[PDB]
Each structure stands twice: as C-alpha cells, then as structure tokens.
Design brief:
Chain lengths: ~150, ~210, ~80, ~50, ~270
C-alpha cells in the first residue's frame, strides 16, 4: 500500500487492457461476440496447474507483483510465428498474434492470477513455459496441402 | 425544389474530390475541407440558382510529409466541365490549359458521358496524366464504406524492401485492375503497390499487399 | 550461391510432421539394406523400431535440404532440429 | 428418393471443380500460401 | 434472387414515419403501374367533347388532331402510392414538351381521367400509347420493383457499456442498383449491401468483394446449422479474387491461368 512506483506498472497494465477492449469492440468484433476459435486453451492449462501443485489453500502466495507484470509482457515477445530480424517481419509477427496476445492478457491479469487462480512461484513459471511450448506446436506445418 | 437536389449532389461530389486530394497527399486547407453547404450555395449559384462549374476549379500542392514520402508528386488541377457531353472541342482546350500552366495531373469531372472518340484523346497528352470521373460516381465517397479497408500506396523504397523480404518477382503479387474504383480514386499507375490493412476475425489485424496492373 | 549461411537461417527450428515421416522411412530403408546402425539394438529388431530409437536419441546422420519458393535452400541437420 | 438420387450428382460435380481449382496450393517455408506458379494467394495462411 | 440490404441513418431508423418517406422515394413506379385503362376517341371539336361523362370537367376547365388519347388512373393505387394528378402530369411535360396537351380531372371526380391530344395517324397513336406505357417514369430508382420494411435487431453498447439489443428499421429490395440507391438522401451510404457481388466489384472494388463473397458463402453453409472453420472459406475467396477480377470455378476461369498444359488439360 502506498507504493507509487509499483502503481506505475499497474496503471500501465490497466491502460494496456483499455486499449485492447477499445480496439476489439470498435474495430474487430462490432457485434459483441466474445466467443471465438483461438489457439491453445488457457482455461484448461490453468486448472491443470491447480492440480499438479495442489493449488487449493488460503496459504498466502509468495508470488510478487513485478514478476507477474514483467513475466506476461515478456511472454508476448516469444510467440514466434516468423523468425528473422527484418523490420517487416517483426511487424508481421506482431500482427499475426495480435488477437491471441489480447486473450492471454485478459486471463493473466494481476487480480485474477492472485485472487482467482491463486498461482505460486513454481506454478506460474510452469504456466508461461507451457503456453510458449503449445503455441509453437499449434503452427501449421510447411508442406501442408491446404 | 428539384434545383436543390442538383446543388446538393454537386456539393457532395465536391467534398469527395477534396477527400480524394487529401488522401493522395496534397495539401487542402482545414477551412475548405469543412465548408458547409450553405456557404457553398452562396458562392457558386447565380441569382437564378444555377451553378457555375468554372468557379469550382482549384489547385493544390503536396504536404511536406507526402513530398518526403513520394518525390514524384507535383501539382494537381481539378476541373468540373460545364459541357454535359464532352466532345472533341472541349478536350482540346482542356489539354492545352494543362500544358500551358504545366500541371502535373488533371482530374476531369464530366456530367453525362464521354464519347469513345474523345476517350482516345486521353493518353496522347503524356507525361501529364489525365483522369476522368462521372459526376454520379462521386456522390458517395466509397472509401467510407464498411467493406472497403484503408488503402495506402507504398513508396518505391518500401516496395523494393518488400520484394526482397519475400524474394518475389513483381508478377507474383495479387493484382488490382486499373479501372477498379479504389485504384482510380488513388490515381494508381502500373507498377505501384497498395498496402491494405484489414480486419480479421482470427488474428485481429492483417496486412494484405496488392500491385496495380 | 543458392545456399544460405548457417547464421542467417530463417525457417522453423522444429521438425515438421512431414520431415519426421520422411526421415524415419528413409533411415528405416537404409537399415534394412544393412547400413551401419548408430545405436545399441536390444530386443526391438524391426527396421522401423530401430530408426525410431535413433531419432529419440538425436543420432540420425541426415540433413534436410528445405527448399524455399525461389529455389534457394537452408540445410538443417536432423541432429540440430528440435523434435517434440 | 428422386431428390437424393438427382442432387447427389449436382454436388459431386461441385466437388470435382473445387478440387481442380485448389489442388496445387501449398504452404511454403516462409509462411506464404502459394500455387505452383509461385503466385501469392495469402501472405500468411489463414491470417494466423 | 437479386436483393439489396439498405440500412438507414440512425435518426431516421428509429422513426417509422420518416422511413416510409424513404420507402416511397426509392420504389420504382411507372405510368403503367398506376394506369387502369386507355381509350382512343374521335373528338373533332377541340373546344368540346362528345363524351357526356367529361362534359362538366372539360367545359369548366377551359374557361390539332381530332384523335383523342384518354387514359384513366386507378384511384386506389394512386392514393396508396401518394401521387397527385399534378406531379404525374409534370413528369409527362418534361418528356413530351409541346407534342401533347395534358388535361386532368379533379380528385373529387367519380373517375380520375387524363386527356391527351397531339398538336396517316391511326396507328401512330397505338405506337405512341405503347411508347407511353413502356417509358414514362413517375419517380423512384430504376430496377427497384419492391421495397420491404424490415426490422433489424442490432446489438449496440449502452451508455453504461453493457451490450443491449436495439430494434432499428431497415429496407430490403427486389432487384439491384447499388450505385443509385447509395446516393439517395436518408440512406446510410456507408453501409448499404447487395447480394450480387458482381455489382459490388463494379461499385466498391476488389477488397469489398472479398468480404461480400465470404458473407454470401458463409450464410449458405451456416444455414443448416453446419459450421466450417474460417480459414477454408477464406482460402477459397482469395483464389477467386487474386487476379483482381472474379475468376469463376468453370473452364472459362480455371484454364485461363499460366499453369502447365498437362495440368490444365486434365480438367
């Protein structure tokens, strides 16, 4: 409580979420439909993490706030569809995963990670690794006669 | 009465032409773009209410940003033709006017039709470029439609960078015909590429490229 | 000329299902024609099984030549591509 | 019975023309979707 | 079944009376649509008439060829369509200038009558009568034979931000003329849609055709409850639009490609 420096991150988090909601509601999904086909189902991944590490408990969590905000933001740069450093590729890579990044950020929000899913340090790092691994596995394979 | 619908459609066509000029990179003053219909009737109609097309012509220059991006952008001359049927007589004075005042591009709005004989006088006036539009087709600015995403012409440097990234010959990109409504609106010439950023229900945002024949 | 240098390789670092199937079959075929096998063979003596065992230990001595649309290509060894 | 017997050949012809239109379209290693001429049909398959 | 979906501006869409005004201006009405009967008399005296029925009509009104063209308008269809004798005669004036004297009876009369005279011609009047019924346009947009008043349930966010339903009036037509209907005041010119994508290509360009093509295919598949993932229908419409024009999936489209002869001859 009172920490203005930690409040600057959480403000930037909420500002990011406001951009997404405004972008998606006014440009992408005008009619308000919010259920859509998307890759790697985060709801199932989280409830598996709750089982492996027995994430019942009121045992206060040792998972600090800067680990959450920086963890999620760093994840969205490792969802490689196209590799290469060319400026056009990075724009294309960012465009390809725009909708999916919004989906992740909408779930791995600070309050939900701590109040609802109740992840600890061991489980949260595992969740990030699994999302990263399963997204790669969901890319179409070159050679596919689509 | 019926005179009001003539003025109204013509006034709407005028706002569309200004929008067209703005999107191509030319500078249009923020007072002329927002000019209301009432001010327009006062300046253009006679005492009998009939409009004088020759008072509507105007000249525009590129913005500094557009000149930075496209170094081939010169002066644009927009003209509304007072003669409903454009014959051999009208076209000669128009081509002469463009050359004498050395405009880079001229936009020719006609009223009813253009005879096929007069249509051959259009590519004989190069390196100046003449484009024609029927007044009906400009009453609505089609780029404001939901189904038409924003087209942005790529510069020559951006185009070359694009072809190398995909290791493409020019003839391998998807195409858009020259007489397509959005290509004509931008005054696209052969070899130029538009970039098209488009809504997508699976990824949110997607950039499509097309090259103009 | 056409070959792309190792530091500038851009295609995906995961073995695709199509590359996997071709590698297993080709290596299986070579073993049935009595090519030297690079792993210990215990109880599993089928040609396909031995080839699948070599794959799991990253010991298949083959290189994928992945052709790109313009005709250029990146050579990737099966020793360095990550298999799920 | 007439409908099932008649319209089965209508849709059978539909599927034949669709396959020949699309048979040569392949995903390449740069992510583009191209036909046998190397024409780009989509810059990225399915836009995702 | 060519059809337009004509969304209206918001202020008009929630007021049924204003929407009806838009309806009558779009709908095509010819002279033939409102005419019940035509007649050809021999009326030799230009200042009088042998017809006892039009006696009091023409005698009080007045205070060239002997052949008279007398056409009768149906009161019911004229009343429903909201057309006056004056405005019907106005449209006739512009196209028939000084070759025809037009005289109309009053709306209070028992029969609604319009008299015409020219100022060998027995057949010329039959040819002119054919020419009249086939070309005189009283109002409206050509090609729009019927206009339906359709209610749309569109989901729009509240001021509170919660998604709520909202009923709005729109129009749908039989027949198409996308360019002309877009320009009509009252019509939301940024959203009008047509189920003929051939016409869309001429009016809106190739990228709009892509979305319209997808919408029409999806509607067909989704109708019997089926669902096909987006990427498959998306793939088909990109093939159909890559050349910049619509390539049909027939021999006339497919085999006009620069593909090899062995491949093309197998179809």
């Amino acid at each position: 409580l009172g920490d203005v420096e930690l409040q600057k991150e959480l403000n930037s988090e909420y500002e990011q979420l406001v951009s997404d909601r405004k972008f998606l509601r006014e440009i992408v999904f005008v009619n308000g439909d919010h259920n859509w086909p998307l890759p790697v189902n985060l709801r199932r991944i989280i409830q598996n993490a709750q089982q492996i590490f027995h994430l019942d408990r009121a045992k206060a969590s040792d998972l600090t706030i800067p680990e959450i905000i920086h963890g999620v933001r760093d994840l969205c740069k490792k969802l490689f569809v196209l590799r290469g450093e060319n400026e056009l590729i990075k724009e294309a890579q960012q465009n390809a995963t725009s909708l999916f990044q919004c989906l992740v950020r909408a779930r791995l929000a600070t309050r939900r990670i701590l109040e609802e899913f109740r992840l600890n340090r061991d489980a949260f790092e595992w969740v990030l690794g699994t999302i990263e691994a399963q997204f790669q596995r969901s890319l179409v394979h070159p050679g596919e006669m689509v | 009465e019926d005179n009001n619908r003539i003025i109204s459609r013509l006034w709407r066509s005028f706002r569309t032409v200004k929008e067209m000029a703005a999107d191509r990179g030319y500078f249009i003053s923020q007072e002329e773009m927002d000019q209301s219909l009432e001010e327009f009737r006062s300046k253009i109609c006679d005492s009998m209410g009939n409009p004088q097309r020759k008072l509507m012509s105007f000249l525009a220059n590129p913005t500094p940003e557009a000149l930075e991006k496209y170094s081939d952008l010169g002066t644009l001359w927009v003209e509304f033709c007072d003669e409903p049927s454009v014959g051999i007589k009208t076209m000669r004075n128009f081509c002469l006017r463009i050359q004498e005042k050395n405009f880079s591009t001229g936009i020719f709005i006609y009223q009813n039709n253009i005879t096929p004989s007069a249509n051959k006088m259009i590519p004989t006036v190069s390196p100046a470029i003449i484009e024609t539009f029927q007044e009906s087709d400009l009453v609505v600015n089609i780029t404001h439609h939901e189904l038409v995403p924003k087209h942005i012409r790529l510069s020559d440097g951006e185009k070359s960078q694009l072809l190398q990234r995909y290791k493409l010959k020019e003839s391998q990109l998807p195409r858009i015909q020259r007489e397509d409504p959005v290509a004509r609106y931008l005054g696209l010439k052969r070899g130029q590429v538009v970039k098209i950023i488009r809504r997508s229900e699976t990824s949110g945002r997607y950039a499509s490229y097309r090259i103009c024949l | 000329e056409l070959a792309i240098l190792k530091e500038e390789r851009t295609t995906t670092p995961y073995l695709t299902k199509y590359e996997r199937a071709r590698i297993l079959g080709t290596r299986a075929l070579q073993i049935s024609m009595n090519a030297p096998v690079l792993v210990d063979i215990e109880g599993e003596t089928d040609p396909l099984q031995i080839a699948m065992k070599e794959l799991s230990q990253r010991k298949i001595p083959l290189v994928i030549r992945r052709y790109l649309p313009d005709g250029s290509y990146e050579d990737w060894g099966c020793d360095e591509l990550i298999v799920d | 019975l007439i409908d099932t017997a008649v319209k089965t050949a209508e849709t059978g012809y539909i599927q034949r023309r669709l396959v020949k239109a699309l048979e040569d379209i392949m995903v390449h290693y740069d992510g583009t979707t191209r036909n046998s001429l190397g024409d780009i049909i989509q810059f990225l398959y399915g836009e995702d | 079944t060519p059809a337009l979906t004509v969304y209206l501006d918001r202020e008009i869409a929630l007021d049924i009376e204003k929407a009806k005004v838009i309806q009558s201006s779009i709908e095509y009405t010819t002279l033939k649509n409102v005419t019940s009967a035509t007649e050809i008399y021999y009326d030799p005296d230009p200042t009088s008439t042998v017809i006892e029925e039009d006696f009091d009509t023409v005698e009080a009104y007045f205070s060239q060829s002997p052949w008279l063209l007398r056409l009768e308008l149906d009161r019911a269809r004229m009343l429903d369509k909201q057309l006056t004798m004056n405005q019907v005669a106005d449209k006739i004036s512009e196209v028939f200038s000084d070759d025809l004297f037009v005289m109309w009876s009053e709306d209070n009369a028992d029969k609604l009558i319009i008299r015409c005279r020219v100022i060998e011609e027995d057949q010329m009047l039959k040819r002119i009568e054919a020419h009249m019924l086939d070309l005189i346009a009283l109002r409206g947009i050509p090609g729009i034979s019927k206009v339906y008043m359709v209610k749309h349930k569109v989901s729009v966010p509240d001021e509170s931000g919660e998604y709520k339903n909202e009923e709005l009036w729109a129009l749908e037509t039989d027949g198409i003329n996308l360019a002309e209907v877009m320009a009509v005041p009252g019509v939301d010119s940024s959203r009008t849609y047509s189920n003929s994508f051939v016409e869309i290509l001429s009016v809106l360009g190739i990228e709009a055709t892509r979305s319209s093509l997808y919408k029409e295919i999806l509607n067909v598949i989704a109708f019997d409850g089926s669902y096909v993932n987006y990427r498959h229908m998306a793939l088909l419409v990109d093939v159909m639009t890559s050349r910049g024009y619509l390539m049909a999936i027939t021999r006339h489209g497919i085999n006009r490609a620069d593909t090899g002869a062995l491949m093309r001859c197998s179809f």
